[PDB]
Design a protein around this nucleic acid. Structure first.
Lengths: 51, 103, 50, 152, 70, 91
RNA sequence: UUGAUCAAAGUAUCACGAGU
RNA sequence: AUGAGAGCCUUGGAGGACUGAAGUGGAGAAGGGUUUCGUGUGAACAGUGGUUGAUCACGAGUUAGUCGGUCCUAAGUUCAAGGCGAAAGCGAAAAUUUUCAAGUAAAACAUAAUUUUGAACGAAAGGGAAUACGGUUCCAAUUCCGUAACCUGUUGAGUAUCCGUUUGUUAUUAAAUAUGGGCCUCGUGCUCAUCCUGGCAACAGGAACGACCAUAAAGAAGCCGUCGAGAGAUAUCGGAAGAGUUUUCUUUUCUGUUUUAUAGCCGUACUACCAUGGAAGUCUUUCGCAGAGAGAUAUGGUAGAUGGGCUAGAAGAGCAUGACAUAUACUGUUGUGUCGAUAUUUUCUCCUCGGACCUUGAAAAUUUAUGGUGGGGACACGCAAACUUCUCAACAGGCCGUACCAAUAUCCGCAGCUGGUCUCCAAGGUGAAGAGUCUCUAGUCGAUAGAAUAAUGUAGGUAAGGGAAGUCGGCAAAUUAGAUCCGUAACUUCGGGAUAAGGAUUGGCUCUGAAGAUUGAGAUAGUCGCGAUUAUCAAUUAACAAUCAAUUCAGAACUGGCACGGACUUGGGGAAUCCGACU
RNA sequence: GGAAGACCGAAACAGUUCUGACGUGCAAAUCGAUUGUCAGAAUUGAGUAUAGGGGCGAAAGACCAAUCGAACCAUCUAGUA
């Protein structure tokens, strides 16, 4: 939940990918920091691809 | 460490000996003693702390100036600004209501 | 102690001066059969209580 | 601390002096803060106003009832209890109420009572379960102890 | 000392008072502090240029007894 | 996960006091310890303060109520019944 | 409707004048 | 060295050990009552001795406006006789005792709405005005001396406070905390007025009608847990300065580096409010689910600062260290005092949010604010004022306690009695740990001493083979035990049983992998002269590139009576019956 | 996430076994290992309150100053035998 405030406040993540991604951080499914970095190199390219 | 002989002859751990550990200029680690905690008044009916004024103990309030223990408005250090804002427009409306009811 | 009355330090004043030997001269008065001080209290041996 | 039913800190104006006269009442059920209570003879029937038994109509349920007319509130004062006004009489003004034992009393018809079932009930329905909840139940009441059986 | 002053005449102001028995001065290698013993308080004026020291040194009520540490 | 099967709140009491004496106290520990929905504020924050006194945190009303529920069903008839009994008395 | 109230306003007649 | 005499305690130097921070340590409560501390010393006492002594003899010693009492009220003592009793007297939350009142600079023709209880005690741990540092004695120290503060009280002196205009000044202005206004010939004339001002708001400033009635608040608080802030400590890595060690080797191993009250100023975290604004594609945020159309997120601000950073204190304060130097006294003097960082309620304090409860967690003194009617202050050409809730100055502060022990020798237990007797501070190591073993600071080696090691003993070990045969009975002893992973039965109130059972692993050495933090990195074009100088973003981007920090977890080789929880610390387990449900 | 008169255990408080020590004691109830509890019906101080055919008692006729199937003290009293 600090990396995430680094990723809203730069701009790299929408708000709507917080109250999806806070609640999966609060909730076990993120082991390291390094996996959460790689649902932002993965769940982010799709929204750009769908756009 | 050194360890601390206290200074007063009350040896129990009451509220009237709260204490702190301070290095002196001689480098000698004494007790200073801590007074009870000053506080800021409460609202009339919010029962929450009033903005504006410094916290105090009842002994230290005689040696203060007036603006340190109240704010500026009517019902200053007594009512919160929101309750007074309620107490105005309740009091205005009911005197207003008691006219049109009485005619 | 360290926290005593005024009345208790005054009575413990008096019992500090009654705690004395006999003067060396009154053994020599004519008809003075004061052998020793008889009522010498002693701090751990007799207390006071009284 | 010791009671079973909550109490209400109502305060009125004193009519002959300039004082606000703070009053402890037995709280009837459903009494928020900042409710107006209307204690008097010409009041209307809503909980928990007080008003003498003469005004309020038969079938209503009351609490903190007066026993002798003016004595401030004796009968039916514990949590969950109430007393229904079961009948009237215009001959010599004596009203039958039914008290929480079921014994139907004949109080006179000018003594005050507060309408409504008294808040904080019914609390005797849950087990104390432990003996250190009866120790706590009674350490602010009195020393009706652990009571030993006298047969022992 | 619980007080220092900043303005220079204010330091000269308190020197000419009916209290304020004596004035102490202390040279440091960096600066030179001036201290005036008053009744309730004690006021410090600190100067650091080594040339306004003797300027503000007299500049003085003459009957004010100095304390001198060099 | 479903941490328990049956006991739920009274697992704290666990394996003591009797099965059918801890079946009953669960009734009144689910109902106490509960946010009810405030009737003056609308926001569900009304927990109990002491036995019989219920208080809502946001906008600070304190309402006297039941010992474990907030509003007993014996009272809830009477709160209606005196409303019927009043409208036949004024008129 | 979780305000507010104490300590006379008015009124009449006299004191109806004193100082002036 | 004493001394007639020394195992003591007699002492001093070496010394080997113990307590081991939950001490055999340093201080207080109750209790004691001079035991305290110097100078002496024979007998007695000190279950040995004694040159020593808590003994004996003789001299001494306890310093307060700030530490306490004293002041307040708690449970309670219940206490005007209205009453009662033959009296003495009274298991008196009196409940009635004309005013049974506590009362007010208050008018007439018993000041007026008013108060029912009088009256007092009751806490050296609750409530409560305020002080701390450097020094000093053979003995006292927040009490003396030094220096810097403060509180209570009384008193004194400065301090919103002089207007338009025009006295200064042509006017602009200037004393003046502000003027205006018509008139008028402008006005010189007339007239009018100060119980301060700012900010939209939260609120802000040097003060700015308490004399009452009234309301609110503080005083005014338990328990358990708790994100975060700082203190204190301990701890590495750096400077310095001096010690330690040199079989041999060790940029080593160590000590030291400090800043009290009181203030001034910056001050930001944290919580809550204020303004603009209007939220679904719901967003905010915590370890924890807390919020939001009853105004969220945002942007700016206000409040509180308990938190520190500066700077006064701070004389290189003083202190501490380390050089000197001086037959030497009260000595003169040099030089230092500096960086970063990591850690825990090994501990206080502040703040935040919680939790349990048929438990819901003191009263009064004292204080403060605001609201109120009436009354006072109240001219503007000013003179001023200001129980002024501002600043400064004088003066004063009485009574009583203050030594010492606090216990294997000052207390109680008839005693120098292994018992008992309330608290506070709290180091390093290994470790989960204020455990157990070892140690540092302080503290002791005082328990009558020497010789010798028979029997029986009290206490502790080991024992072939067998393993309960012993015995009333496995009493006593023995076994097991920490940790990680596997795994787990009958029965059940479904919660447990359960650590059921039953197994495997563990040292040392050298490696590898995983877990984070601050900086981002910053392409690209040209200037000046590689230096110096000037910025956008696609992507980047996992220990991106640097820099820094943490100690946990997973592996892997090599390795030795294969002895590895190598001491310590530390459940044997299972099948039943009978009783009590359980704590 | 952190509930519970839940668990093992330190301080403390208690006192199971050894029928260990001791038993003209260290002690008119202690010493030693072994055990019981340990966040609560918890353990403690200080001030209070209850007084003897009375009190207090989670009850043993326990405790009420080494005294308890009735405290202690003085007297009646040189009771009677």
């Amino acid at each position: 939940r600090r990396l995430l405030k680094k990723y809203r406040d730069s701009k790299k993540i929408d708000r709507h990918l917080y109250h999806d991604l806070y609640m999966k951080c609060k909730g076990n499914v993120f082991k390291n920091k390094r996996v959460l970095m790689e649902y932002i190199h993965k769940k982010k390219a799709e929204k750009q691809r769908s756009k | 460490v050194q360890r601390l002989t206290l200074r007063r002859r009350l040896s129990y751990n009451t509220r009237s000996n709260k204490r702190r550990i301070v290095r002196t200029p001689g480098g000698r680690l004494v007790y200073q003693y801590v007074k009870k905690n000053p506080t800021v008044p409460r609202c009339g009916q919010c029962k929450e702390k009033l903005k504006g004024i410094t916290p105090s103990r009842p002994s230290e309030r005689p040696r203060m100036s007036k603006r340190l223990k109240t704010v500026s408005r009517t019902y200053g250090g007594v009512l919160c600004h929101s309750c007074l804002r309620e107490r105005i427009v309740r009091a205005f409306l009911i005197e207003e209501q008691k006219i049109v009811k009485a005619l | 102690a360290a926290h005593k009355s005024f009345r208790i330090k005054q009575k413990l004043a008096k019992k500090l001066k009654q705690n004395r030997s006999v003067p060396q001269w009154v053994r020599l008065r004519t008809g003075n059969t004061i052998r020793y001080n008889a009522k010498r209290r002693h701090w751990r041996r007799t207390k006071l209580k009284l | 601390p010791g009671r079973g039913a909550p109490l209400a800190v109502v305060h009125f104006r004193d009519p002959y002096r300039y004082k606000i006269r703070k009053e402890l009442f037995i709280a009837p059920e459903g009494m928020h803060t900042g409710q107006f209570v209307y204690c008097g003879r010409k009041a209307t029937l809503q909980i928990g106003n007080v008003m003498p038994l003469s005004q309020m109509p038969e079938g209503t349920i009351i609490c903190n009832l007066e026993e002798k007319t003016g004595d401030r509130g004796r009968l039916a004062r514990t949590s969950g209890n109430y007393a229904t006004v079961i009948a009237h009489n215009q001959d010599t003004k004596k009203t039958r109420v039914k008290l929480p034992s079921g014994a139907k009393k004949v109080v006179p018809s000018a003594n005050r009572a507060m309408v409504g079932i008294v808040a904080g009930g019914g609390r005797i329905d849950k087990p104390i379960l432990k003996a250190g909840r009866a120790y706590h139940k009674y350490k602010v009441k009195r020393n009706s102890w652990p009571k030993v059986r006298g047969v022992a | 000392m619980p007080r220092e002053i900043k303005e220079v005449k204010d330091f000269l102001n308190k020197a000419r008072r009916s209290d304020a028995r004596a004035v102490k001065i202390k040279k440091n290698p960096t600066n030179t502090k001036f201290k005036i013993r008053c009744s309730r308080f004690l006021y410090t004026l600190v100067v650091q240029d080594k040339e306004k020291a003797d300027k503000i040194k007299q500049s003085l009520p003459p009957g004010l007894q100095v304390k001198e540490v060099k | 996960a479903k941490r328990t099967k049956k006991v739920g709140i009274v697992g704290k009491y666990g394996t003591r006091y009797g099965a059918s004496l801890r079946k009953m106290v669960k009734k009144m520990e689910i109902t106490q310890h509960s946010k009810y929905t405030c009737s003056f504020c609308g926001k569900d924050s009304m927990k109990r303060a002491v036995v019989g006194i219920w208080s809502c945190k946001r906008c600070k009303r304190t309402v006297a109520g039941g010992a474990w529920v907030y509003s007993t069903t014996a009272a809830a008839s009477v709160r209606s019944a005196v409303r019927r009994l009043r409208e036949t008395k004024e008129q």
